[PDB]
């Protein structure tokens with residue numbers, strides 16, 4: 001997956017007008033947008049096609065899929081029908097739940113990203129202790145795309161170690177949550193940035209600035 | 219606690235508005251509480267909640283298995299309650315701050331949170347099972363009053379009931395299609411959740427009536 005400027009926009013505004021305007025303002029800097037439930041539950045799944053029509057960006061559906069296999073399959077089908085290129089799935093519910101998502105993705109020509117450790121403080125309670133095992137489970141299942149935390153670079157490095165250099169790794173928690181763009185890109189293929197861009201006075205200048213700070217990383 | 223008619227909640231996971239409305243309408247005399255999840259919402263929009271309230275006046279539990287960071291959890295809960303959901307189902311495994319975020323929105327908006335502590339499928343044994351007692355205890359410490367736990371593992375469901383106490387409200391899926399028994403589950407749960415056994419039946423009303431007949435002495 002070739003992500004322009006190694007930068008994925010987390011578009012978590014909850015108003016169609018604002019989301020479209022802000023994404024338009026930063027379009028020259030990105031070609032990959034992560035759309036999650038804040039926007040989808042506010043404006044509907046049709047917003048995905050709207051983004052493809054307006055921006056011709058790739059779309060990652062950040063739906064944190066975390067149900068039983070039967071329901072996961074249905075969620076993946078609905079999501080890919082809406083035009084998402086990829087979907088983010090939790091590993092904590094186990095291998096069968098992940099495999100259900102991999103099956104649908106294969107059937108519809110899409111990608112699954114496995115979320116192995118999360119970036120927020122609460123992740124330390126239960127997820128962190130399972131995270132290495134979840135990553136190994138991903139490897140066992142043939143997962144090639146992973147998602148891990150900018151806010152703990154040593155944990156992100158470990159994730160990279162487990163999955164190897166051939167796997168693709170994206171990482172949220174940059175900016176607002178305290179993660180550093182350049183340090184994160186030591187390990188991740190691409191950084192995910194939400195509030196630092198979409199809540200900025202000037203989103204375009206915010207994106208431009210981030211990219212300036214990592215310019216020697218590409 | 220919510221007064222669930224016949225201790226039976228419909229898991230409406232059909233993905234077509236026409237079929238979902240037909241089936242729900244057919245069992246309305248037996249069930250006043252409907253669990254709507256992402257299969258239906260991602261297919262038909264959040265306005266499906268509005269349509270169910272307009273058509274049936276049923277209580278709506280939004281089964282969104284909320285499992286994000288606190289800031290995103292807050293946004294999801296706000297959007298969900300804005301749409302008319304009475305309650306939302308939240309994962310505990312992302313930790314206390316993520317759960318608290320949902321509780322805070324529910325409190326502000328006058329709605330309810332159900333904490334999912336453990337799951338019914340085989341994969342739940344890998345990571346969730348080992349954390350479940352602590353996730354449940356965390357819920358109690360946070361003041362969670364409503365819980366969601368698996369019918370397919372009676373011993374686990376019993377332990378969850380112990381942890382949360384008799385005053386807490388507990389709903390339980392995995393009845394029917396996944397092998398859980400209605401009566402046995404209601405030893406511990408306040409209400410059972412049933413999806414496929416009802417919504418894939420040739421006569422969903424007869425399927426619901428049959429389940430209720432089997433637990434008649436427990437009503």
Ligand SMILES: O=c1cc(O)n([C@@H]2O[C@H](COP(=O)(O)O)[C@@H](O)[C@H]2O)c(=O)[nH]1
Pocket residue numbers: 010012036062115117118119120148149172173174175176177192193194195196286287290
């Ligand atoms: O561990 C994780 C996994 C996520 O998907 N996310 C998501 O990544 C984005 C982070 O956005 P922000 O840059 O505003 O903090 C949000 O959409 C959040 O839901 C995260 O923050 N931490």
Ligand SMILES: O=c1cc(O)n([C@@H]2O[C@H](COP(=O)(O)O)[C@@H](O)[C@H]2O)c(=O)[nH]1
Pocket residue numbers: 067068071229231255281336337338339367368391392393394395396411412413414415
């Ligand atoms: O542990 C759990 C938690 C759930 O929410 N569920 C949900 O409960 C319902 C079970 O439906 P069914 O009766 O068709 O097996 C589905 O909506 C599923 O997503 C579950 O099966 N197991």
